Ligand binder design. Structure first.
Ligand SMILES: [Cl-]
Ligand SMILES: [Cl-]
Ligand SMILES: [Cl-]
Ligand SMILES: [Cl-]
Ligand SMILES: [Cl-]
Ligand SMILES: [Cl-]
Ligand SMILES: [Cl-]
Ligand SMILES: [Cl-]
Ligand SMILES: [Cl-]
Lengths: 16, 16, 16, 16, 16, 16, 16, 16, 16, 16, 16, 16, 16, 16, 16, 16, 16, 16
C-alpha cells in the first residue's frame, strides 16, 4: 500500500 | 505513546 | 487521537 | 529491532 | 522511492 | 496500492 | 501526486 | 520507484 | 520535539 | 500526495 | 466512461 | 479513443 | 517530445 | 494486443 | 508512436 | 508475456 | 532510540 | 532542523 500525505490547513498520513 | 494505524485497505494514523 | 498536521510553509503536529 | 505493526481495525507497534 | 505500508496481521513500512 | 516503476537495463510497472 | 491502483474484481488507476 | 502524477493545466507522469 | 513538514505541493521534514 | 524516500549517503522523506 | 481493469490472477482492460 | 484523467486533487481514468 | 495531460475537470493526452 | 495486470496484492504487466 | 521513459533515478514520459 | 521498459537515458517498451 | 532504514533499493525499518 | 538519514546497509537519523 502507498503511504500518502493527504489533506488540504490540515493534513495527515494515510495508507492505500 | 504508541503510534497506531486505524482503518480497514485504507488506514489513518492515531496516537495513544 | 488522530495524527494531524496543521499549518499553512510549516505544518506541525496538532495535539489532539 | 524491526518496526512492525501488529493488529487486525487497530494496529500498534510491536515491541521487538 | 515510494514509501509503502506492507504486510498482511503484521505490517511494516518499506521503501522501494 | 502503490504504482511503482521497478527494475535495474530493464524496468517494469508493478503494483503493491 | 501518487499514482495508485485501486479497487477490489474491478480495479482502476487513481491519482491522489 | 514511485509512479507520480505531477504538474499544475498540464500534468505528466514521473517516476522517483 | 515536534515533527514538521516544510515546503509548499512538495514538503520535506524537519524537527524542532 | 506520495510519501517518498529520496536521496542518494543522505536520504530523507519528501511528499509530492 | 471509466477505464477499468477487470478480472480475478489476470485482469484485462474494460471500458464501462 | 483518447484516454483521459477526470477529477478535481483526485483523478481517475475515463474515456469518451 | 513530452507526453503530457492537458486540461482544466477533464485532462487529455497531448504531445509537446 | 490487450495489456493486462497479472499477479495475486502484487501485480505486474503482461500481455498475451 | 512508441512511448518512452526518459531521464536518469527520475524519469518522465517522452515520445519520438 | 511481460511488458517491460528496456534501455540505458531512454527506455522503450518491449514485450518478452 | 534511533530510527533506522535497513536494506540495500529496498529498505525496511528498524529501531535501536 | 532537517530530518536526514545518513548511512551506506544501515541509515540512521543525523542529529542536525
Ligand atoms: Cl486491516
Ligand atoms: Cl502547503
Ligand atoms: Cl484538476
Ligand atoms: Cl487538493
Ligand atoms: Cl488479484
Ligand atoms: Cl494482500
Ligand atoms: Cl536510467
Ligand atoms: Cl538515483
Ligand atoms: Cl542503500
Amino acid at each position: 500500500a502507498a503511504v500518502l500525505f493527504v489533506g488540504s490547513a490540515v493534513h495527515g498520513v494515510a495508507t492505500v
